Design a protein around this ligand. Sequence first.
Ligand SMILES: [Ca+2]
Ligand SMILES: [K+]
Lengths: 234, 225
Amino acid sequence: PVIEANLSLNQNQLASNGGYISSQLGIRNESCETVKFKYWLSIKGPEGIYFPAKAVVGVDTAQQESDALTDGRMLNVTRGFWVPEYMADGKYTVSLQVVAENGKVFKANQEFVKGVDLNSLPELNGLTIDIKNQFGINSVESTGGFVPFTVDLNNGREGEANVEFWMTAVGPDGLIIPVNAREKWVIASGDTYSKVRGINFDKSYPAGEYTINAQVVDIVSGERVEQSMTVVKK
Amino acid sequence: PVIEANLSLNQNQLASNGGYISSQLGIRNESCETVKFKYWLSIKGPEGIYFPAKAVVGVDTDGRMLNVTRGFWVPEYMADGKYTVSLQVVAENGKVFKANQEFVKGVDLNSLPELNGLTIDIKNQFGINSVESTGGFVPFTVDLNNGREGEANVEFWMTAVGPDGLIIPVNAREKWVIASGDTYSKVRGINFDKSYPAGEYTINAQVVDIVSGERVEQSMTVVKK
Ligand SMILES: [Ca+2]
Ligand SMILES: [K+]
């Protein structure tokens, strides 16, 4: 409630040769007192890519500086970034992030895609990957909870697909919790491999953000595609 | 404390075609009372690779020690580069214990990461692994040495991937055209403000050769208490 952040991108679909995205950042203080904070814009992408929105002509020497907003006041700022051709095709998340002086974190995220269609299933050349938080459960209590995920791999290819599949939960304190062991499946042409797999968040697991991360590999082509979903343990 | 975790790899260097790594897992309870915990074995690798090697198992152990060996295959298709194997234990009381070991695939252990003759030497300058909750500053040395016959056209940046989905800029994107035999050399630090959340930050550095399109990352951990 101290801060409300908002983000819009000028476009959300880029070709494989990349392009330029401009963004509008809004940070509003809806509180009764002045709020001091730091903020930045960062991008997460495929193949473990993380990069800041900011690019400099020479040596980056800046510090992460605070700003402050009087009660009822807002900041409206504009930022752009190039997405080079060399960066992996796939799904990217742009994240406006604000850390208030009191430690509260506020985020506003938007996605864009590069060389794949927007709102189209991640795929490995006709083998389509549909992994979903089954009941839309975005968080669990500190005392523990369980979250099931549906996994549907549709083989739209003319021939059979040989895939390897696994899942982990990448969490606070460097944790990488197994969710689904490595499995190898042979999927006939026109078949869909379906299963449901859940993770139990034991009471003892640390509070914070967990990325449920599914990886699918075509064992013949060696190509790999990921799907990530977030669950917060309160 | 309640748990000591130990990890040993039988081998730390695979060729590009990969192979088999056998792990020795040691977990000892050397506190006064008996201890309940869950443990597992997972691997982190280049290009956002994370994969399990051993499922979550709950154990109710003391001066007792648990000893298990567990193996895993690293297939050819996985990226060449540096991997970390992590034996992870969470005690009932919420304390987390990790024992990590690295292996490489398709690159030499004890050689610098490189992009075809351009070497990338990025280090936590003073080996500072953690900072106080009230804040601290950690400097990193960056040395990109062009040992090639011609120019290297490179792009460089850094972030701190931290708790609460944070991705804190550490070094904005820089572009350098480095002459044969020249170096790009700097020290870049990150100030962890008091306000930043407690937990693990991965200082993630990337270097790209713009011409080949090849990218190397270097990841380094700092914990804010
Ligand atoms: Ca464009
Ligand atoms: K934590």
